[PDB]
Amino acid sequence: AVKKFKPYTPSRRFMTVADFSEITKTEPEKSLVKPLKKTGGRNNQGRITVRFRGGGHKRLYRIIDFKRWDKVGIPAKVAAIEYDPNRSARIALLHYVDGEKRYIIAPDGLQVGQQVVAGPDAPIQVGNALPLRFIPVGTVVHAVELEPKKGAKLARAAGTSAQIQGREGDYVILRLPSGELRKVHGECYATVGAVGNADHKNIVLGKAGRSRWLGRRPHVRGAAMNPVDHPHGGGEGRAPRGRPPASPWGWQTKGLKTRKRRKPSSRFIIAR
Amino acid sequence: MKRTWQPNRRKRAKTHGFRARMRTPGGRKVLKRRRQKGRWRLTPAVRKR
RNA sequence: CGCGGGGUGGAGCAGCCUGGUAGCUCGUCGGGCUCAUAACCCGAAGGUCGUCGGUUCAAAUCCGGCCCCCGCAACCA
RNA sequence: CGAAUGCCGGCAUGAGUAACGAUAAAGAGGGUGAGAAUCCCUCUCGCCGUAAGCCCAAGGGUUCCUACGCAAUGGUCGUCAGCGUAGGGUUAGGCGGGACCUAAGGUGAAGCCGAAAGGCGUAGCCGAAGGGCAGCCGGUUAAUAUUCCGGCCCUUCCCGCAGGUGCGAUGGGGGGACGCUCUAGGCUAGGGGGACCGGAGCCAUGGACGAGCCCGGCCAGAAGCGCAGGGUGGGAGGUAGGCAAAUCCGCCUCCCAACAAGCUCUGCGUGGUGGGGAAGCCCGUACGGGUGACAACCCCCCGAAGCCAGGGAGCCAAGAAAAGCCUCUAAGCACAACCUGCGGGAACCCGUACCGCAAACCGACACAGGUGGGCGGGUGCAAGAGCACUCAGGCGCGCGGGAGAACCCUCGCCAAGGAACUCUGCAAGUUGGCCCCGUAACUUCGGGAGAAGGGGUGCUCCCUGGGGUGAUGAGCCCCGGGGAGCCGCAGUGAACAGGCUCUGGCGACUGUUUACCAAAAACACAGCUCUCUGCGAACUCGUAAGAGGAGGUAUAGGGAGCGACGCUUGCCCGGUGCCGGAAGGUCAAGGGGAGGGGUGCAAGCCCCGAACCGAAGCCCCGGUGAACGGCGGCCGUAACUAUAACGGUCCUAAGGUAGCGAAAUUCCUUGUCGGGUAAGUUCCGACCUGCACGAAAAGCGUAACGACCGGAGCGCUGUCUCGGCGAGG
RNA sequence: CGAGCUAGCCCUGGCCAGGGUGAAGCUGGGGUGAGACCCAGUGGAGGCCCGAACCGGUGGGGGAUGCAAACCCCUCGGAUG
RNA sequence: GUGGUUCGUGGAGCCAUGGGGGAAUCUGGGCGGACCACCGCCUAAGGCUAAGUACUCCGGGUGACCGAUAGCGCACCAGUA
RNA sequence: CCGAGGGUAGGGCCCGUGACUGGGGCGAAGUCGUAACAAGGUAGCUGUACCGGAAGGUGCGGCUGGA
RNA sequence: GUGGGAGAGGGUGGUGGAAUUCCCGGAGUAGCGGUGAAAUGCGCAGAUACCGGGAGGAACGCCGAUGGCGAAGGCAGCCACCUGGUCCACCCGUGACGCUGAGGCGCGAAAGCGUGGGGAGCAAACCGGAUUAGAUACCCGGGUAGUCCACGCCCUAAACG
């Protein structure tokens, strides 16, 4: 989708909005299973650690289910599909037959009315979740766990997905939304299908405000400020850095790798 | 234009208050000295009810 | 005015700083192949080294004086 | 002690000089008084009136009220006072705050961390104009009143009775509970009109005894209705979720409803009763009292932004918690307990004066400054919180009197010319509201547009079309059309109310900034690209613990630069950076000890110490420019000259492509041609010999946009020729 | 020792008169095999437009032992983000 | 690896120590300035212990100390206005 | 009232002219190279795309007016 | 109409093997590439050649034809669904309903452009090595857009019988 606009105001011409057709006549969220008071704040205890944040629409947290072995075997019916301000993926709310309700990040396909479930059993269909081993090599899938019982963590962004590649001992090779081939443990669930609402990468914010709404204040270039507060700074009419591009704190930012070398997680990785 | 003193009872006891100064090691010393110097008033005289 | 770089056969460049020995590409001349010209092949010629001085036994080469040439600086007021 | 712009104090000079704090404005009579422009009274004049009038809040803290007083305080005076002396004055179960709740955030048992001091820290606690919560109208004081008193109406607790029911928790569920914009129906506040009702009175100056002028025609109000409107399905089986249990909630499944029919719950009327009640006239105030009065207390119209409220519609940026309250069950307990009615008793602490856009708060001051919330009447101008006047109310700003020079400030006007002024039309002028004609290039089809340029605008009479409230009518209130006619110099007659166009530069644009000399072409900006980061992420703060990132997960997050958009973004990896290279060279502690020394009669003890084995880094080998950067010189050549498509040579890591160019880059320079001019170092169009443009410190364009900078025209003008008169301070 | 001025963000309240312009979306019609699309009428979008409150501070003038250690007059930017 | 001592790595002991290795109970162990031999001195890894010494909020005595711009900031209702 | 015309304002078409600039046509014997015609010594022609003093080259697909 | 027939006609989904390139393991050396000849290039840091495994992309050998099909452009492994045209027989039904077609409309190789994906081989531009007088070419080694998919444009051709 992606709503468009006629130019009746510069900016609201290039501006592009999402299409909330996929939003089952829902909107008002569900008390109980979410929401919780969401403590918004751009800095830690005192100081500001991440810069340029703050401001932007008030938000309510939708406490989603990111570990599904909670209900192994208990099937549930997908009730609605709603908007979640805390993420890029739309989310689906679903009523188990157990009578319990919980939200799930909604996969592309999954339609309201559908029945979905989790566990070793589970049929390989959009929405169902199973330990990685039991999933057919090659099938795509989202909401992966990295270590058994620790909760989902990979491919949860709007319309992202990972594809299974092979098996190898108690591990199974994956291919993350980034292109890294990772070795994940067999016992990590991963609900099947891709995340959906993949038009998300196409929304043209539009104006200055639009960014402000999502809570992101203006970002000033180092080049603009002085030597006192950033490498690229001073002296006359602009300047060409004058040294290898660096961050406010001073480490190179055009090429310098960061992953800490001797990490134990190294051996389970294979790509880029 | 607007100036720098905008009186506020709450802020004043809340900041230069007595329990305020007792709470920290530096403030307790603030008291010591003032006590040791004589000062009729150890801390500002906030008021009302 | 000041700083440093440079004048070498006809053209463009080496050759010095560790003085004795001028090298390369083109061009020019004679000869070949072609019907003929170019290409290609075979041979040959050409340099007071910007000039006036001395330095040494000996100066393109070292050192000072001028003749042009090129580039850089001419800021604070 | 004679000097140190010395230190403290006292006194001079400028000097009876500048000032006396908004240009809203004063005059007079009569009081009082030792003493009145300045105090009290009355008459007249002027000023604010979406305040310069009222109600809160914060701050202030006796300033409130009354009596007696001027030495000082008042920018003069002072009999006055916000000043001095004394006395009085602030009354609450319903207002606000606390014996209620939670937000951020603090505090912080458990836990973790830190040389010490201390740092974190799920529970709990604390934390408020957010939630919960029971009072309205009138009367009295010199000063308090939703507080005292009158009327009317409530809320809790406890102790009874009278009945009902498994009662019951800090525990389970429900509710409370939520955005922004736009909105419907019916009400209220508030306001307009009245031939009706109620009133002291009044015929002036030429007319008017008239349905004449003037004044006023309500407020509160339980039950019960009535009118609006908000909430909400009722049964029954099954149950494995709601961290124990539930009959509750949730999930299936059959019934009946789908309607607000019915239950409730608010608001608005109406309501037993209770209260107010003008002008004017009389009085004595420093003000209030009395009469008017048995006051009347009625009919229409406008009408909310307020009420019904958890109303509806739309949208994307997707919009607190906890308690009270309903319900559910657990331990317990069911002679308890809880629910419903009726009684009797109990209901505490603090605030309450007065100032409050200001002479009482923030500014050393009776300071032209600063200060959040609510009410803010009437007429006219299209509307309105704008504008002019003016209600209620409150002012004339605590030095006056004269004078009528220059010169200044603010203001008005001008012959003829009209930008000649000048760095620049700076300043001033022009234009100006509504209604209707009518509008170009260009363009991203929206815009440019209020383009430009025009005409209409008053009042009188006649005819006529819609609504709105009433019934389908009168009136009352909105919107229209058409025809005649009147008067002025002039009809948004005063007040509020764009000068217009052309073309360049910069930046896309709305935004932001050097509080107190710079508002921009600078910052930001959507968007483009590079780069890091697989999640106990990178990164940032911190000694740590920790926290942000993020309750996110590559369509995600951090760093850099570029900066809507269009067409594009060339070549060089030699140097620097970053990246990729299990070969080598070098390499620190350490391993290793050939070998050497010192002492001992000696076993020994103690030193030195070469092979060799030894990381990362450097070297080296590669890559990589939307990484740091760079992107040439000298000669010759064409059948007029001239110039060079062509060539030669030297050096380079490669040797600037496109596009642009006397530029926001051009020194020589007012380059040279062309255009605007009477004339143009500026401007615009070209030319290229680009001192010293050039491709994401982007390049060249670009509709729209601008208190940005340059040029030009029209209009208009005291800017100028070149002044002149008038006004007030 | 200070964030009672000022900068930023967190929690929770408040405020923005009155006019313009008219987006999508609906609805009717047109059209097509079905569309796209074209018309009205409705609709009320917007870092849209005028303009008080309010937030500013552009140009000139006054003020410069000031009324004021940032003021006053005229003029002006934004004003549902 | 450092500190302490006069000792700044010096031929650098001793006395303290964070890091690693790591004993013995009198024929045991430290020290006497690298080390070694001899000759000597002490007996670590547990603790308590007057007096002599410091100071002057306070009381007293004295002054080749001041005499109200001195002397304490204050002679005086001053850590006040 | 209409009204020739004149005045003000802005559009539409056309002709003229303008520094400079684009390509063009023509002009016996100037310079560069050799593209096509023989298999033209890389078969040629082509739509497009990029590049180059120049003819032209190369990429993609097509045609026989070539084998 | 009824009953049948052939077909690389068209759309979507799915799937098979061969080969290539890269990665990993084994084994193995002193050269491999390349051309008219070479050089650039690759390789003792372990290449070329052989084996084993893995990833991915694109095009479908034999069948294959001078064949088929479509209106043209054009269409080729295999499967399925959805779908157009078409030929034969039977002469059953309608009953002149027919031919052409300004405009409109739809389709339209390749290159190209937009947004996103993908990227093995190839290959404009470009960089190197030769050849030449000079080579911005022909040859050789590199190599980017592109070639591939989705959707939206673009309308050209020796779109040729």
Ligand SMILES: [Mg+2]
């Ligand atoms: Mg909750």
Ligand SMILES: [Mg+2]
């Ligand atoms: Mg911190």
Ligand SMILES: [Mg+2]
């Ligand atoms: Mg803190």
Ligand SMILES: [Mg+2]
């Ligand atoms: Mg994009």
Ligand SMILES: [Mg+2]
């Ligand atoms: Mg920035």
Ligand SMILES: [Mg+2]
């Ligand atoms: Mg700066």
Ligand SMILES: [Mg+2]
């Ligand atoms: Mg800093």
Ligand SMILES: [Mg+2]
């Ligand atoms: Mg720096």
Ligand SMILES: [Mg+2]
């Ligand atoms: Mg510069």
Ligand SMILES: [Mg+2]
């Ligand atoms: Mg530089």
Ligand SMILES: [Mg+2]
């Ligand atoms: Mg710099």
Ligand SMILES: [Mg+2]
């Ligand atoms: Mg100077």
Ligand SMILES: [Mg+2]
């Ligand atoms: Mg002296």
Ligand SMILES: [Mg+2]
């Ligand atoms: Mg003095």
Ligand SMILES: [Mg+2]
């Ligand atoms: Mg004087």
Ligand SMILES: [Mg+2]
């Ligand atoms: Mg005087």
